[PDB]
Amino acid sequence: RMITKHTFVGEGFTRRPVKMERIIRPSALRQKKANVTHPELGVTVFLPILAVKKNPQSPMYTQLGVLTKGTIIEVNVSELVWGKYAQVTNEPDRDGCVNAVLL
Amino acid sequence: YVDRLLKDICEYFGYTPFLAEKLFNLFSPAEAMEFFEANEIARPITIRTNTLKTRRRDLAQTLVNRGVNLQPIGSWTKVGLQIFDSQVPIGATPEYLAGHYILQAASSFLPVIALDPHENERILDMAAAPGGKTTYISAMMKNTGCVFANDANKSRTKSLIANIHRLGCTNTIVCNYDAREFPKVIGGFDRILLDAPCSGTGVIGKDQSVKVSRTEKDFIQIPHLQKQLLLSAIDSVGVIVYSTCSVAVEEDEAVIDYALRKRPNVKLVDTGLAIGKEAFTSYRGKKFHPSVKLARRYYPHTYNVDGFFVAKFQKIG
Amino acid sequence: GYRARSSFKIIQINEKYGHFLEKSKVVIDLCAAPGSWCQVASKLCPVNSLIIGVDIVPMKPMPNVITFQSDITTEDCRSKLRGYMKTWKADTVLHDGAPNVGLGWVQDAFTQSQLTLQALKLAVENLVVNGTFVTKIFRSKDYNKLIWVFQQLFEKVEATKPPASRNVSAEIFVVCKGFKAPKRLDPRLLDPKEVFEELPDG
Amino acid sequence: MRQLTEEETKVVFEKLAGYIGRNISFLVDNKELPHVFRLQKDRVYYVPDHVAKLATSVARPNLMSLGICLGKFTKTGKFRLHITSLTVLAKHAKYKIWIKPNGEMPFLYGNHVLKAHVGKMSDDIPEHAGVIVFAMNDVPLGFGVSAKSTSESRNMQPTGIVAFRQADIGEYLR
Amino acid sequence: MQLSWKDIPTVAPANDLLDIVLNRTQRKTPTVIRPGFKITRIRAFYMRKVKYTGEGFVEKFEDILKGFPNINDVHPFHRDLMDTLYEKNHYKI
RNA sequence: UUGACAUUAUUGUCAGGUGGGGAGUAAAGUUACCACAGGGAUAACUGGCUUGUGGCAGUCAAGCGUUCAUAGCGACAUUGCUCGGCUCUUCCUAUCAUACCGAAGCAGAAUUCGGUAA
């Protein structure tokens, strides 16, 4: 069975699925840079995702990297007081990008 | 004028004032054009051809037939192959998985080049995180006697148990320890190897956490830790090797120079084998050092390596 | 996992013609709009081959392959091979010449037959002694004229149209192994005005 | 760390006698480096004799791995053979299978061995006997239980299995 | 091109430009689909609309870019004449 | 199994490490990591569907909040980066052309947008 939800896959993709025998994730549904806004200073910094941490609804989805509404993700601060984690707010299956708010 | 360049490092690179000041004093503007201008190269792609499974002359053919540009480094060993241009995956080639070669840096070679492992003897260890260097221990050995492997991290042992069995070393007692209480565990009479438990941590092209997040408190306790690890290394034996990946003095040639006085059983022999520049005497209001000439040095711009220091010791009684 | 279906009909031509691309160091690639000739010139020629592509379309560069992307018939692009390939002379010279087909077929074959002579004059200028010249050419009224000028400017001229072609298309891949490299070249010969001079009536 | 019982060695030697034949006598009798094997936390480790003799000082929590790991004892009481055994196994192989240079990476991702590779295999192979997969250079790739005999696998349609994949060296990417 | 440029397609003031391109995708494409159709026809419907609006804006933008004279490639008199009458940096911005 | 000491390789002591191997006071928890066989529970009904302007966070902010802006919701804007194809009949307009108009630096020609229009 294939997933029709937007996911993030880490850079060790080439032979990663030990426990994901036939869990097809197409390359079109892979969004790498979340459109993250900063709460304390109303500026939006379009930064790459590093790690998918805690997706509610499913603990399968945490191990697949699914980016449904409420997922806490890790944000790369290479471009740069800052908080390393952000919680997503949109449903990227419906709209274009992934929209997250820092914690 | 100095403060102009200190404004042209902490703003140009986005760098810490604490490190920019402590790595410019008694260093030339020419040397400032060597070290600081070399943190964009980011580790030239060398390789460590495992001598156990295959000789190098039988591995030059293997990658070239798949279209890999290869050329040996200067004088040291034919083992080190510089990769220039390859399209075949740089970790997923069947020969990686076989254990014919491990992907290393050029700085990963030399602390074990300086050490000379012989037949039937035991080698002890304290902090070898990936296990790339313990490969060079148990290949010159040709799988005889004992080889200890150690690091103080339960998460990082997975790289060791991956690389040892990957490259086929057979003689590895890979075990997690606290490195300080090590002579009380066993204390094997034959030689030991120590490398880089460091706060100075040279070449920022690898880790840019050094660029921003290094204060004085790291330089207080981590040089103290690696200082005590020497005091356990000299209580194991027998040719001690202690090295680090840092150009700052508070890591090498202040830590080794402590343990030189602290035991009369310590002799510093000619460390490296091929090339590597001469060591200093005065370290900004520091002691007399005519004995510390042989502990070699390497720069990121004089040669295409990553700046580090080696110190090889001998014990008598 | 190549770029186009034009990739599978030179790797097929090498096996039939003694793996000539295996031994070859430098290659001048013509008319390659996809990289279906430089990819297979990378997997056949030895490492650091230094192969040069010329095509009318401007498109991307490929790793390990230098490719200039401009005109074929001008003197300035001839000064871009003069810009590079003066010190080294090409071992082989490839030709995937193909027009934008769909106009009468009479002209769709004659602008091809015209294009191969201009590719020849870029080849006769920049080829090593006893090399080769592989060419896509349409079977037409003026094919027998091209095979003759090939016959008197090369050693052995052999036509193919290998398997893994369309089978319906009127393609020929003709190879011309062995190159004369004369000091006296006939100027009236190589020009297309005298080449397609039609045979008199019976 | 502990020494094996009488039955616990027999369970290991039978599984090793599935791939290596009766040439398991090469593995224990050497006299120079006799190569005894021990286990830590229910997982056997193959080493030189003295290198395990001096490592009896390491604590059980402090220990991680020891030389060459063969495989672990299952909770039910069987013996698995992990990929790390191959460096010891392929040097003393009995039934050996090669593959295509083209059909190498399918095997290296976890798929089985298809019939689409025809040449010179081993002979006298039983249907359900352990085979060892080689890839020019005779590079060992992994284990395998054979699908059919040598006779049956020659007159077959190229998309049928000849050797069921058990463990491959692609596990070194995890 | 040469001496003068009267022949330029007009420039919509970015609010009306939206009202041209978006209305054309509403009028020229099919607009009615049930939820009860096959998923393949639903996909192909909305794909056709995203792409058609894509070509819409691109067509209008290409008309502007090709229409206006390439200031530094025309002629030294005209390169400087347009630089005097209009802020050349802003004309290129 | 390592060090120290003595015998001055061999042997002793002490000290350091392991030690359900023996003496004394086995197997079990877990599982949405879950892979195969079995038992349950339904899936897949225009409840006028469908079309052109995204989403997330903030800035305003008509009012309503049980009084009411400091129990909270809040439209248009705005600011953040980014299975295909051959042939015919009839119908629809969401019209490409033909007909007539309106706006447009629309000198003329040519054109762009828009309206009526099948």
Coordinates of N, CA, C and O in Angstrom, one line a residue, chain A residues 36-40 73-77 80-87 100-103:
Chain A
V36 N 8.3 28.0 7.9 CA 8.2 28.3 9.3 C 8.2 29.7 9.7 O 9.0 30.5 9.2
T37 N 7.2 30.1 10.5 CA 7.1 31.4 11.1 C 7.6 31.5 12.5 O 7.5 30.5 13.2
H38 N 8.2 32.6 12.9 CA 8.7 32.9 14.2 C 7.6 33.6 15.0 O 7.0 34.6 14.6
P39 N 7.2 33.1 16.2 CA 6.1 33.7 17.0 C 6.5 35.0 17.7 O 5.7 36.0 17.5
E40 N 7.6 35.1 18.4 CA 8.0 36.3 19.2 C 8.4 37.5 18.3 O 8.2 38.6 18.7
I73 N 8.3 19.1 14.3 CA 9.5 18.8 13.4 C 10.7 19.6 13.8 O 10.6 20.7 14.5
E74 N 11.9 19.1 13.4 CA 13.2 19.8 13.7 C 13.5 20.7 12.5 O 13.5 20.3 11.3
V75 N 14.0 21.9 12.8 CA 14.3 23.0 11.8 C 15.7 23.4 11.8 O 16.3 23.6 12.9
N76 N 16.4 23.4 10.7 CA 17.8 23.8 10.5 C 17.9 25.3 10.6 O 17.3 26.0 9.8
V77 N 18.8 25.7 11.5 CA 19.0 27.1 11.8 C 20.4 27.6 11.3 O 21.1 28.4 12.0
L80 N 20.1 31.3 10.5 CA 19.8 32.0 11.8 C 18.9 33.2 11.6 O 17.7 33.1 11.5
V81 N 18.0 34.8 19.8 CA 17.3 33.8 20.5 C 16.4 33.0 19.5 O 15.6 33.6 18.7
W82 N 16.5 31.6 19.6 CA 15.8 30.8 18.6 C 15.4 29.4 19.3 O 16.2 28.9 20.1
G83 N 14.3 28.9 18.9 CA 13.8 27.5 19.3 C 13.9 26.5 18.1 O 13.4 26.8 17.0
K84 N 14.6 25.4 18.4 CA 15.0 24.4 17.4 C 13.8 23.6 16.8 O 13.9 23.1 15.6
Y85 N 12.7 23.5 17.5 CA 11.5 22.8 17.1 C 10.3 23.6 16.7 O 10.1 24.7 17.2
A86 N 9.6 23.1 15.7 CA 8.4 23.8 15.2 C 7.2 22.8 15.1 O 7.4 21.6 14.7
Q87 N 6.0 23.3 15.4 CA 4.8 22.5 15.2 C 4.0 23.0 14.0 O 3.7 24.2 13.8
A100 N 4.7 25.8 9.5 CA 4.9 25.5 10.9 C 5.2 26.7 11.8 O 5.6 27.8 11.3
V101 N 4.9 26.5 13.1 CA 5.2 27.6 14.1 C 6.1 27.1 15.2 O 5.9 26.0 15.8
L102 N 7.2 27.8 15.5 CA 8.2 27.5 16.5 C 7.7 27.4 17.9 O 6.7 28.1 18.2
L103 N 8.3 26.7 18.8 CA 7.9 26.5 20.2 C 8.9 27.3 21.1 O 8.7 28.5 21.3

